[PDB]
Design a protein around this ligand. Structure first.
Ligand SMILES: Nc1ncnc2c1ncn2[C@@H]1O[C@H](CSCC[C@H](N)C(=O)O)[C@@H](O)[C@H]1O
Ligand SMILES: Nc1ncnc2c1ncn2[C@@H]1O[C@H](CSCC[C@H](N)C(=O)O)[C@@H](O)[C@H]1O
Ligand SMILES: Nc1nc2[nH]cnc2c(=O)[nH]1
Ligand SMILES: Nc1nc2[nH]cnc2c(=O)[nH]1
Length: 613
C-alpha cells in the first residue's frame, strides 16, 4: 500500500533522476541517524536518492528500503562492499533516456523477487521436512531423501479411463524431446535402468544440462549399439532385452533403492512390430513391479487400430516433440521402494484407449515451439504429493511459503492463521497496492500482528524477516543478498524463532518508516508518545512487526540504563535507526474501541497479558 523502496543511485547517474516524476532525496554526509528516519518518512511513493551513504551499514540502509543502482559493480558502505542491486548498462546511461532507465530498474526489480523467496526457502530447507503449496522451484532445491514436498500444482494433459482433453494452454520451446524426457521423469530415483538408450548423446546432454541429478543417479544403460562410457555411474550393456531376466541380474537386492525403469526400444511390411515392443516394455515393467517405483514407456499410437489396450497409469504428450509426431509416453506408477509417496497415482493397470482422443492430444500439445510449461507440469505432477496445506495435519516440522493467500483460499483465514501458528516459516500477502502480476488477497496487517505473534512465533513483514535472518543466521542469509525491500514488505512472515535475549530493539523489529505522516493521515481522516506509537502502528494498517518481542523490548529492557543497554546491543551484534504498561493497555483499548467484531480477540489476549505478564 505504502511501503516504498529508496531507489538509490550513484553519482554518475544522479543527473538523469532530477528530470523524472518520482521525488528526489538529496543527502549529504550528515545526516544523523534521526535525519534519515524523519526524511525517508516524508515519502509516500518510491523515491530516488543520491549522495554519500558510506557511513551507513547495509542492514541500516535495507531497513530504510534502499536499492542500489549504478553503472559500477558495487558501492562502498560502512559495513561491507555491497554488490550493486541494479546494474545500469553503459548504453542505457547515456543516451540519458529517463524511460529506458526506469524500465531497466523495473525489469531487474521483477527479477529480484526470486532472491527474496530463495532466501526464505533456503532457511526453510535447513529447518523443515515438509513443504506445502510446492511447485518445481521447491523440487529443484530439495533433497528427495529427506524433504517431503506437497502442493496442488496445475495438472497436465493426461489420459486414462476416463478422458478430459483439452483444454489448451499457451506454451514455449524447450529442450529436445529425449533430454526433456529425462528432465521431468528423473527426480527421486537413485538407479535408472534405461533400455534402448541409443548412442548416449541424449544421456550426455542430461549430464551437461543437469550435472547434479545426473551424478546422484546410477545409470544402467542397455543397447546393442551403445558406445563406451567412461562415466563411473554409467554401466553400459550391449545386450538386447527380451525378458526381465536381462535386468534382474544387474540389480543389488540386499540394499534398498528407488529404481526407475525407462523403455525407449524401437527397430528398423508393417509395424505390429512397434506395437509388440511398446507392449513388451510395459509387461517387463509390470513383472518387475515391486523392484521399481515407476516406469516410463515409449508409446507410439497405431494407425490401423481405432481402439486397443495397454498397461498404464497415465499417457501424456511429449515436450519438445514435433507436431506430426504421433507418440506419447506411458507413465506407470508401480509398487517398489520410493522416496516419494505416489500412491495417489493409480497403480498401473490395463487401459482401453481410443486412438482419436489420443490423436487429439498430439495435435493440441506437440510442436517444436511447445513444451516448456508442459514439461514443468509433468515434473510437478509426477513428483509432488497432492495435498491441501490447510487440511494436512503433520508430524514433521513444516514450511508454508507463498501460497496461503492465493485467491483459491479466500475466506479461510482461521485455517490460514492455524498454519501460521505452527509452521516453521510461512508467508501471507498484506500488500494493498493494486498490484500487478500477483493474484493474492491481502490479510489486514493489524490482524496479522494481533493473531500471528506468540512466545514461539515471530511475526514480521518480509523485509524485517530477512533482516532478522541476516542477523541470526549469517550464512543462511548473507548481508550481500540482492533483494527488493518494498517487495518483501508486501508479505507478512511468521518464523518458529524464539524472542531474542536480551530482547534488543533490532532493525528487524523496528523501522516504522513514515510513522509521523501516518499519524497525521489518521488524525485528519479518522480521529479518536509510546502509547500513540502503538495505536498509530496498528490503526494505520501500514506495518507488520512482532508484538510479543516488542512488548518484551519495551518493559523488560529500555529503561533500563542508556549505558548498560548498548552494551547489550553490541554484543547482540544488533543495530538500530533511532535513539508504560498502562499506556500500552490504553492504546489497545482505544484500538478495539474503534473496531470490535472486525477483530480483535486479542486485543483482550494482549490486554490480559500486559496486566499480568
Ligand atoms: N490451500 C492450498 N493448499 C495446497 N496448495 C495450494 C493452496 N493454495 C494454493 N496452492 C498452490 O501453491 C502454489 C503456489 S506457487 C508457490 C511456490 C512455492 N511454495 C515457493 O516457495 O515459491 C500453486 O501451485 C497453488 O496451486
Ligand atoms: N530389445 C532391445 N533392448 C535394448 N535396446 C534395443 C532393443 N531393441 C532395439 N533396441 C535399440 O533401441 C534403440 C532405439 S533409438 C532410441 C533413441 C535413444 N534413446 C536416444 O535418445 O538416442 C535403437 O538404437 C536400438 O539399438
Ligand atoms: N518473492 C517471491 N519469490 C518467489 N520465488 C518463487 N515464487 C516467488 C514469489 O511468488 N515471490
Ligand atoms: N522437467 C523439468 N521441468 C522444470 N521446470 C523447471 N524446472 C524443471 C526441472 O528441473 N525439470
Amino acid at each position: 500500500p505504502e511501503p516504498h523502496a529508496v531507489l538509490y543511485v550513484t553519482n554518475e547517474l544522479s543527473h538523469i533522476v532530477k528530470d523524472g516524476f518520482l521525488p528526489i532525496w538529496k543527502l549529504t554526509g550528515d545526516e544523523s541517524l534521526n535525519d534519515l528516519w524523519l526524511e525517508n518518512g516524508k515519502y509516500a511513493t518510491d523515491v530516488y536518492a543520491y549522495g554519500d551513504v558510506s557511513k551507513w551499514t547495509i542492514r541500516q540502509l535495507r531497513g530504510h528500503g534502499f536499492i542500489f543502482i549504478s553503472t559500477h559493480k558495487n558501492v562502498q558502505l560502512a559495513d561491507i562492499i555491497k554488490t550493486v542491486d541494479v546494474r545500469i548498462p553503459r548504453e542505457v546511461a547515456r543516451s540519458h533516456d529517463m524511460k529506458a532507465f526506469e524500465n531497466e530498474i523495473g525489469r531487474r526489480r521483477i527479477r529480484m523477487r526470486k532472491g527474496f523467496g530463495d532466501a526464505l526457502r533456503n532457511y526453510a530447507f535447513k529447518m523443515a521436512i515438509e513443504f506445502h503449496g510446492s511447485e518445481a522451484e521447491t523440487l529443484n532445491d530439495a533433497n528427495p531423501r529427506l524433504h517431503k514436498i506437497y502442493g496442488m500444482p496445475e495438472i497436465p494433459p493426461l489420459y486414462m479411463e476416463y478422458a478430459e482433453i483439452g483444454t489448451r494452454f499457451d506454451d514455449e520451446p524447450t529442450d529436445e524431446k529425449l533430454v526433456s524426457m529425462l528432465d521431468y521423469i528423473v527426480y527421486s530415483a537413485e538407479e535408472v535402468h534405461y533400455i534402448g538408450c541409443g548412442d548416449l548423446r541424449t544421456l550426455m546432454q542430461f549430464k551437461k544440462r543437469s550435472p547434479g541429478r545426473f551424478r546422484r543417479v546410477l545409470w544402467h544403460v542397455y543397447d546393442p549399439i551403445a558406445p563406451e562410457c567412461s562415466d563411473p555411474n554409467v554401466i553400459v550393456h550391449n545386450i538386447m532385452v527380451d525378458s526381465k531376466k536381462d535386468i534382474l541380474k544387474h540389480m543389488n537386492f540386499l540394499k534398498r533403492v528407488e529404481r526407475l525403469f525407462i523403455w525407449d526400444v524401437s527397430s528398423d511390411e508393417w509395424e505390429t512390430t512397434r506395437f509388440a515392443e511398446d507392449r513388451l516394455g510395459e509387461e517387463i515393467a509390470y513383472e518387475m513391479g515391486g523392484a521399481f517405483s515407476s516406469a516410463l514407456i515409449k508409446h507410439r499410437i497405431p494407425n490401423s487400430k481405432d481402439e486397443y489396450h495397454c498397461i498404464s497409469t497415465y499417457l501424456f504428450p511429449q515436450p519438445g516433440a514435433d507436431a506430426d509426431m504421433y507418440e506419447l509416453r506411458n507413465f506407470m506408477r508401480l509398487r517398489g521402494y520410493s522416496h516419494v509417496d505416489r500412491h495417489m497415482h493409480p497403480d498401473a493397470s490395463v487401459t482401453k484407449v481410443v486412438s482419436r482422443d489420443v490423436r487429439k492430444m498430439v495435435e493440441l500439445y506437440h510442436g517444436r515451439d511447445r513444451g516448456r510449461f508442459l514439461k514443468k507440469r509433468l515434473f510437478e505432477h509426477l513428483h509432488i504429493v497432492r495435498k491441501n496445506g490447510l487440511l494436512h495435519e503433520s508430524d514433521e516440522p513444516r514450511a508454508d511459503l507463498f501460497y496461503l493467500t492465493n485467491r483459491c483460499n479466500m475466506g479461510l483465514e482461521p485455517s490460514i492463521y492455524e498454519v501460521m501458528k505452527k509452521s516453521v516459516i510461512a508467508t501471507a500477502w498484506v500488500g494493498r497496492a493494486p498490484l500487478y502480476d500477483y493474484d493474492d488477497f491481502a490479510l489486514p496487517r493489524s490482524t496479522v500482528m494481533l493473531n500471528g505473534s506468540y512466545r514461539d512465533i515471530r511475526i514480521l513483514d518480509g523485509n524485517g524477516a530477512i533482516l532478522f535472518l541476516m542477523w541470526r543466521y549469517p550464512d543462511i542469509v548473507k548481508k550481500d543478498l540482492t533483494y527488493d525491500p518494498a517487495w518483501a514488505m508486501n508479505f507478512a512472515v511468521s518464523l518458529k524463532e524464539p524472542i531474542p535475549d536480551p530482547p534488543v530493539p533490532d532493525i528487524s523489529l523496528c523501522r516504522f518508516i513514515g510513522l509521523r505522516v501516518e499519524s497525521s493521515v489518521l488524525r485528519v481522516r479518522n480521529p479518536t508518545d509510546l502509547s500513540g506509537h502503538l495505536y498509530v502502528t496498528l490503526m494505520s494498517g501500514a506495518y507488520v512487526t512482532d508484538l510479543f518481542w516488542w512488548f518484551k523490548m519495551i518493559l523488560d529492557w529500555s529503561a533500563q540504563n542508556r549505558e548498560q543497554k548498548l552494551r547489550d546491543l553490541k554484543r547482540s551484534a544488533a543495530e538500530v535507526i533511532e535513539w508504560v504498561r498502562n499506556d500500552l493497555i490504553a492504546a489497545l483499548r482505544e484500538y478495539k474501541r474503534k473496531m470490535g467484531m472486525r477483530e480483535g480477540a486479542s486485543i483482550d489476549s494482549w490486554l490480559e497479558l500486559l496486566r499480568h505478564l
